[PDB]
Amino acid sequence: ALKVGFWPAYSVSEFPPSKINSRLFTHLYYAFAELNAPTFEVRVPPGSEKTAEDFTPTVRRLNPSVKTLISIGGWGSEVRDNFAKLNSDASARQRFVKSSIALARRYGFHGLDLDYQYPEPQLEMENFVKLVSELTAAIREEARTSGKPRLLLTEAVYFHQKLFPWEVVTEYPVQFIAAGLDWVNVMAYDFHGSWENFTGAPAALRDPNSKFTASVGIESFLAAGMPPEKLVLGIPLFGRSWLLKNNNEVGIGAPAVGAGPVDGALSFSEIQNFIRGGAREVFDTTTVSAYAYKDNVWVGYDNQQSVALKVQYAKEKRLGGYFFWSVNQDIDAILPKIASDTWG
């Protein structure tokens, strides 16, 4: 049973690793190491070496049996473009594989994660396969030479097995992945947000009149032949916010006029403050989700109830477990506790 949390190093000032309740997790990820083009000598951001080093011993103080992984990449065009440059260059791939393994070992991480959004189109998937093929070979060789247990290898995946459901240009090679990776982190969120001019459930578990749901995505990996234990269901600890066109239209599907605070996203903790400050919270049973609104601000997120429901779902579907992005966004570890209690 995998209980996974992502900690972003950029949150270090407001939420250092010591604040993580690691008793609620089996694995904690450090996000993110840099690809560092053009050499592709992977590294943590220069000047953060101490933070990277202290991460694992720190989180193990509260839970000595917790394991850690370091994630390489992240979202955005720069990371995507750098993966694309890297994967097409055999020499660069060799430098990446060598430096990534060294990076994990340097700081005492138990594994590596690749966060590439996204390996499309077909050429990019094929070249990513080359990278992972070489990385897995090196991981096994490093275990034999060192006498240590091999590093874990995971990767972030789109909510759906096809890239993309509406226009398929490539797809995740599920048998390759099941063979080479310990698990995948399914990003079952950001289905809806301020890029749309209507409010919606940003991480809907299901929806009777929509294909953008966690369940539809999970079903697609399972249909493709992925062993269910290889799938780890992502749950956001943030919500997507909109500014309402009309303050008296406050339900799902209400017209909107742009991103709410802060640039279209609020942490769960910020959403708690929003409610304590007068916002009305609604649970939407149709989508298995929450939303909250006050004046012209509307936010959709996962709450205590929807998280319990999503974790039970993951158990029903026989998944490997769940992950949260990102742990700094729930300062009192409200949702990680509910999730851990639900699975146990």
C-beta of 142 vs 190, nearer to ligand NAG: 190
Site for ligand NAG in 140-169 (CB under 6 A): 159
Least distance from ligand NAG to the Cβ atom of residue 228, Å: 21
Q: Using the rule CB under 6 A, which residue among 118, 191, 221, 268 binds ligand NAG?
A: 191
- Residue 269 near residue 19 (C-beta atoms within 8 A): no
Q: Does 172 bind ligand NAG (CB under 6 A)?
A: no
C-beta of 12 vs 259, nearer to ligand NAG: 259
Q: Which residue is nearest to ligand NAG (CB)?
A: 190
Q: Does 171 bind ligand NAG (CB under 6 A)?
A: no
Least distance from ligand NAG to the Cβ atom of residue 100, Å: 25
C-beta of 96 vs 189, nearer to ligand NAG: 189
Tell the residue number behind the tokens 């060789």, with chain if given: 141
CA distance to 142, 194, 250, per residue, from 279 (Å)? 53, 19, 11
Least distance from ligand NAG to the Cβ atom of residue 165, Å: 8
DSSP E strands, the chain: 2-8, 27-33, 67-74, 111-116, 152-158, 162-163, 170-171, 183-187, 231-236, 238-244, 256-259, 265-267, 280-284, 289-294, 297-301, 321-325
Q: Does 198 bind ligand NAG (CB under 6 A)?
A: no
C-beta of 109 vs 191, nearer to ligand NAG: 191
- Reported as type and span, the H/E element at residue 132 is helix 122-146
DSSP 1: -
In 3-state terms, what secondary structure has residue 51? helix
Least distance from ligand NAG to the Cβ atom of residue 241, Å: 14
Q: Using the rule CB under 6 A, which residue among 55, 107, 212, 313 binds ligand NAG?
A: 212
What are 316's two structure tokens?
């029903």
C-beta of 124 vs 142, nearer to ligand NAG: 124
Q: Does 207 bind ligand NAG (CB under 6 A)?
A: no
C-beta of 237 vs 250, nearer to ligand NAG: 237
Tell me: cis bond preceding 189? Omega within 30 of 0 counts.
no
With CB under 6 A as the rule, give the number of residues binding ligand NAG: 5
Least distance from ligand NAG to the Cβ atom of residue 71, Å: 18
Q: How far apart, in whole angstroms, are the C-alpha atoms of residue 39 and residue 92?
A: 7
Q: How far apart, in whole angstroms, are the C-alpha atoms of residue 229 and residue 233?
A: 10
Q: Which stretch binds ligand NAG (CB under 6 A): 78-86, 98-106, 137-145, 188-196?
A: 188-196
Q: Using the rule CB under 6 A, which residue among 14, 195, 223, 246 binds ligand NAG?
A: 195
Q: Using the rule CB under 6 A, which residue among 34, 190, 207, 302 binds ligand NAG?
A: 190
Q: How far apart, in whole angstroms, are the C-alpha atoms of residue 74 and residue 81?
A: 12
- Residue 26 near residue 339 (C-beta atoms within 8 A): no
- Report which of 133, 185, 231, 182 is spatially closest to residue 326, judged by C-alpha positions: 185
| Site residues, ligand NAG (CB under 6 A) | 159, 190-191, 195, 212
